[PDB]
Amino acid sequence: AYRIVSETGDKITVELTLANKNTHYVWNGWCFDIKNITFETTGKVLSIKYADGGEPVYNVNGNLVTIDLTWRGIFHLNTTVKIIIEIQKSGDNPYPHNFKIHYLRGESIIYPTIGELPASWKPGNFTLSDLIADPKSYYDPHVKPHQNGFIMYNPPHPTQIIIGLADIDYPLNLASSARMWVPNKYFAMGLALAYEWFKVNPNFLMALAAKENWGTAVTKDPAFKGYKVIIDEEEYYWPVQIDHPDGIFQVESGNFNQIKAYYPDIFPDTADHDDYMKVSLDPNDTAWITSPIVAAVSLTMERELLYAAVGDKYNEFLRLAKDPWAETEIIDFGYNRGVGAIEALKIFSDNWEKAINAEVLWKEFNMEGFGGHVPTVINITATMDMETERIYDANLTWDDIEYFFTVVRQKFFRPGAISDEEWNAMMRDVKRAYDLLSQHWGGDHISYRYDFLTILRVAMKHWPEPHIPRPTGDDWYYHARNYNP
Numbered sequence: 007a008y009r010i011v012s013e014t015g016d017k018i019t020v021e022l023t024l025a026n027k028n029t030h031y032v033w034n035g036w037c038f039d040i041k042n043i044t045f046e047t048t049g050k051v052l053s054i055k056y057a058d059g060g061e062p063v064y065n066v067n068g069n070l071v072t073i074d075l076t077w078r079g080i081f082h083l084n085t086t087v088k089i090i091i092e093i094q095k096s097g098d099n100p101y102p103h104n105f106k107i108h109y110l111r112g113e114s115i116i117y118p119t120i121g122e123l124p125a126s127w128k129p130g131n132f133t134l135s136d137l138i139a140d141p142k143s144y145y146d147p148h149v150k151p152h153q154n155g156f157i158m159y160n161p162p163h164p165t166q167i168i169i170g171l172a173d174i175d176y177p178l179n180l181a182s183s184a185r186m187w188v189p190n191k192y193f194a195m196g197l198a199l200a201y202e203w204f205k206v207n208p209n210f211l212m213a214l215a216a217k218e219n220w221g222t223a224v225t226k227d228p229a230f231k232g233y234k235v236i237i238d239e240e241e242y243y244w245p246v247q248i249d250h251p252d253g254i255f256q257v258e259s260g261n262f263n264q265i266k267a268y269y270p271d272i273f274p275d276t277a278d279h280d281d282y283m284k285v286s287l288d289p290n291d292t293a294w295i296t297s298p299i300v301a302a303v304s305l306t307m308e309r310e311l312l313y314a315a316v317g318d319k320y321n322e323f324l325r326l327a328k329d330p331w332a333e334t335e336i337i338d339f340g341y342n343r344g345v346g347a348i349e350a351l352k353i354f355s356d357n358w359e360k361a362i363n364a365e366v367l368w369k370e371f372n373m374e375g376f377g378g379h380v381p382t383v384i385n386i387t388a389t390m391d392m393e394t395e396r397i398y399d400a401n402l403t404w405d406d407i408e409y410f411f412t413v414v415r416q417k418f419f420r421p422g423a424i425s426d427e428e429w430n431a432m433m434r435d436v437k438r439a440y441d442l443l444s445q446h447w448g449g450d451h452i453s454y455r456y457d458f459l460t461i462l463r464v465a466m467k468h469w470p471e472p473h474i475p476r477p478t479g480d481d482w483y484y485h486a487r488n489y490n491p
């Protein structure tokens with residue numbers, strides 16, 4: 007909001023009022039972190055001061071003027087900042103105009119839409135055709151190979167989830183061989199939500215968990231001792247530290263609390279590290295659902311962090327780099343070593359020409375990671391992507407579907423993001439969509455591979471827009487402002 011304070015002779019004074027009007031919590035409005043403010047004037051700037059005292063840093067670039075709120079750029083609930091601008095009249099456009107608030111968040115960040123519900127779809131009593139565009143491609147068992155890394159830029163199928171359960175010839179954690187394995191259906195639905203919400207490749211999370219703590223992989227290796235697991239009447243070993251508080255993704259307590267502060271819209275105030283990550287042999291453990299999602303958020307944080315600093319050069323880097331897996335290598339490296347490690351690489355600045363021309367990015371920059379973390383994850387991901395013969399599937403009962411959303415309701419979002427009525431209304435849509443899609447299989451169940459993405463999209467139609475909230479808060483403001491990769 008802006009207002010003319012004083013107009014007299016050759017001097018114009020405008021009061022720009024910025025605020026977070028929200029008194030209570032609202033979606034993506036619990037806090038606002040402002041990078042900078044830009045307005046336009048042909049007149050010369052005399053003084054820019056706060057109304058309550060002091061003054062912000064401002065920069066003039068011709069008609070464009072960039073105001074820096076510095077330590078006042080953070081806007082929590084019920085917080086107003088008024089800026090008084092004094093201009094000496096000059097040119098044909100003296101009045102300050104075209105005010106643009108720039109949030110501390112990469113505006114050029116992209117999240118690939120995996121698929122969409124048919125345009126005819128409506129909340130209430132939709133038909134089967136309102137769920138399925140064409141029955142041919144929807145139930146098409148044929149598999150198309152892909153080469154996606156961390157982000158699914160080009161999904162193999164619009165409505166299907168393709169988890170490549172391929173054999174791994176690569177020595178995973180000093181093992182002879184390895185076999186990709188989904189522990190249970192609830193963890194799979196976890197990956198699916200992480201895939202539809204934050205556009206994260208399920209194969210990448212599978213590969214990550216395998217390297218971190220054998221969470222998603224079994225082996226024939228006699229040397230490795232673990233739990234007895236049988237696939238196709240063959241004995242396999244599952245060497246997972248199931249008691250590890252950091253879970254199968256090895257998400258540290260410090261990283262958990264950090265992204266918790268970054269994303270209040272995602273995490274409730276009661277979000278505890280152990281309850282969210284620590285899984286067990288019991289498939290009914292809620293952490294089977296939460297841990298792949300928490301990992302997806304923590305991974306997303308890094309991508310959001312780079313975008314906030316690098317800005318537009320991120321997209322330029324993706325299209326000009328000679329390494330196809332480049333982004334995946336960076337993100338995976340920052341997951342294991344930390345975001346500071348990526349920053350210290352100075353890839354997007356000092357070593358721009360070296361990384362952008364690197365055929366293999368992790369080899370030149372020595373981004374091996376602990377125990378060859380980065381090369382392991384990439385190769386397994388590539389293998390799972392290349393797998394077309396053996397794709398994961400499961401039978402999801404209604405009790406499975408309802409349990410999943412129950413856990414989501416309890417472990418994610420804040421009170422007020424989704425009303426009780428809006429949720430019950432969403433469930434009726436999910437219930438109907440389940441019933442309609444179950445007919446193809448006999449009414450006993452739906453396919454995780456073929457139907458569950460549709461189930462999510464139906465549910466997410468009632469989820470607050472935009473679905474992906476902004477990283478915000480005090481901690482995010484300092485880190486993202488000073489981040490220089």
Ligand SMILES: CC(=O)N[C@@H]1[C@@H](O)[C@H](O[C@@H]2O[C@H](CO)[C@@H](O[C@@H]3O[C@H](CO)[C@@H](O[C@@H]4O[C@H](CO)[C@@H](O[C@@H]5O[C@H](CO)[C@@H](O)[C@H](O)[C@H]5NC(C)=O)[C@H](O)[C@H]4NC(C)=O)[C@H](O)[C@H]3NC(C)=O)[C@H](O)[C@H]2NC(C)=O)[C@@H](CO)O[C@H]1O
Pocket residue numbers: 178179180217218219220247250255256257258259260261262264304341342343344345346347376377378379
């Ligand atoms: C040779 C071989 O193959 N051996 C295998 C072996 O790989 C297997 O053991 C398991 O290996 C993995 C590593 O590959 C072990 O895991 C962890 O993994 C964690 C997640 O990647 C990682 O946590 C990250 O560490 C960063 C550095 O501290 C953190 O960044 C920092 O966070 C702070 C607070 O947020 C912040 O203040 C700092 O600024 C920030 N630092 C920087 C530079 O920015 C980061 O937050 C954190 N990430 C997350 C998501 O939590 C651990 O560092 C890493 N530890 C080690 C020693 O590598 C895993 O623990 C191993 N498993 C077990 C049971 O120990 C093994 C399979 O079990 O088989 C062998 O054969």
